[PDB]
Amino acid sequence: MIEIIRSKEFSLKPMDSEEAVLQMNLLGHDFFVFTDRETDGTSIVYRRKDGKYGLIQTS
Amino acid sequence: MIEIIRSKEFSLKPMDSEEAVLQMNLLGHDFFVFTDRETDGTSIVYRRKDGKYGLIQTS
């Protein structure tokens, strides 16, 4: 029932969250994985239901 | 403007990607961020249109 297929991060170049949202929006996706320029860690922006954007910054 | 609201990772407990898929399905979301037991890094599983699951493993 579970088939997991790896894919790659769009870009490894660090970007800030506002540029990640722009990338997400150009793709038409509801989440986007990027390397965060703030932290050099992996961050994820995502579309909230209210049209704001969430940001998960991992260490 | 782009309004970005920080949110927390669901769990900091490391897990395998097949367990992240179970979490994602339990929560009814189309992506799920987790600490990957295989890598000790941040991974993201996501729902594909074709019923399979994608995995972005970062490190």
Side-chain angles (χ1 to χ4, degrees):
Chain A
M1 67 154 307
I2 289 167
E3 168 171 2
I4 298 158
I5 300 167
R6 291 180 185 161
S7 63
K8 296 188 161 51
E9 217 173 320
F10 184 72
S11 181
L12 303 174
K13 308 206 138 228
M15 70 182 75
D16 83 334
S17 51
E18 293 181 309
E19 306 154 349
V21 167
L22 295 175
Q23 296 286 354
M24 185 185 68
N25 284 348
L26 185 58
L27 289 165
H29 288 188
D30 81 331
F31 73 97
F32 184 79
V33 183
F34 63 107
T35 297
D36 203 323
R37 202 191 301 283
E38 181 167 9
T39 63
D40 200 50
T42 294
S43 289
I44 304 82
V45 291
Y46 58 96
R47 198 171 319 272
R48 297 155 47 112
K49 301 149 147 51
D50 54 14
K52 308 190 181 116
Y53 300 96
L55 171 61
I56 300 164
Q57 297 184 300
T58 75
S59 51
Chain B
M1 55 169 286
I2 296 162
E3 170 152 10
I4 295 179
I5 301 173
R6 278 176 185 84
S7 66
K8 291 295 216 268
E9 197 164 1
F10 183 79
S11 178
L12 304 173
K13 185 174 173 200
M15 67 186 78
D16 294 319
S17 53
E18 59 197 77
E19 298 176 314
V21 170
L22 297 175
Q23 287 294 319
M24 183 178 69
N25 288 341
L26 187 57
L27 303 172
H29 298 157
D30 298 343
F31 72 98
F32 182 77
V33 180
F34 64 108
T35 294
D36 198 324
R37 205 187 263 127
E38 284 185 20
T39 63
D40 302 315
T42 298
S43 290
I44 305 82
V45 293
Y46 59 90
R47 196 180 308 280
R48 294 159 52 122
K49 242 67 175 189
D50 63 3
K52 307 167 188 318
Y53 299 99
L55 169 64
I56 295 170
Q57 286 194 319
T58 78
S59 69

